[PDB]
């Protein structure tokens, strides 16, 4: 009832702003900023925050994404070398 609206004529996409974030596989700068923060820290604030459910839900994103990025680079290098060997034999 309240505040209802609908766009009738055209499928103009509005749930997201369409942006260059479509055209990349990893936000490498966002990785490099997060990896900075969890590695510049040496004897400042405190260790062992295994336990607070709000920061522990932020660590899950980083711990996953850096593992995926490293896994991807391992395949790309094999592909590249394999392409060079394929051409040089043939």
């Amino acid at each position: 009832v309240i505040g209802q609206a609908v766009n009738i004529r055209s499928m103009e996409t509005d749930i997201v702003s369409l942006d260059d974030r479509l055209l990349q596989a990893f936000s490498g700068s966002a990785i490099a900023t997060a990896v900075d923060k969890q590695t510049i820290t040496n004897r400042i604030e405190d260790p062992n925050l295994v336990t607070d459910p709000k920061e522990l839900a932020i660590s899950q994103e980083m711990i996953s994404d850096y593992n995926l990025y490293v896994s991807m680079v391992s395949t790309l290098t094999r592909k590249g070398v394999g392409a060079v060997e394929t051409l040089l034999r043939s």
């Binding site: 062992n48 925050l49 295994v50 336990t51 607070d52 459910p53 522990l56 839900a57 899950q60």
Partner: protein, 75 residues
């Protein structure tokens, strides 16, 4: 330390003096077990204690289970 100790402590800094009051009232009552004025006060303090300790323990249990779920989804 840790967050679950932070939650546990947030009760103990909440009930300022109860931990003492209960033992003090018990000593008085034990001195004269048949005074209704003493009895009436002890009933209250003891009840307030029983409730405080139960609420504390169940809350710590719940936050422990939230963390144990997240650390499994790390895999």
């Amino acid at each position: 330390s840790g967050y679950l100790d932070d939650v546990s402590a947030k009760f103990d800094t909440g009930v300022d003096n109860l931990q003492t009051q209960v033992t003090e009232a018990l000593d008085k009552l034990a001195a004269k077990p048949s005074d209704p004025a003493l009895l009436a006060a002890y009933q209250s303090k003891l009840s307030e204690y029983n409730l405080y300790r139960n609420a504390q323990s169940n809350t710590v249990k719940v936050f422990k289970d939230i963390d144990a779920a997240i650390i499994q989804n790390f895999r």
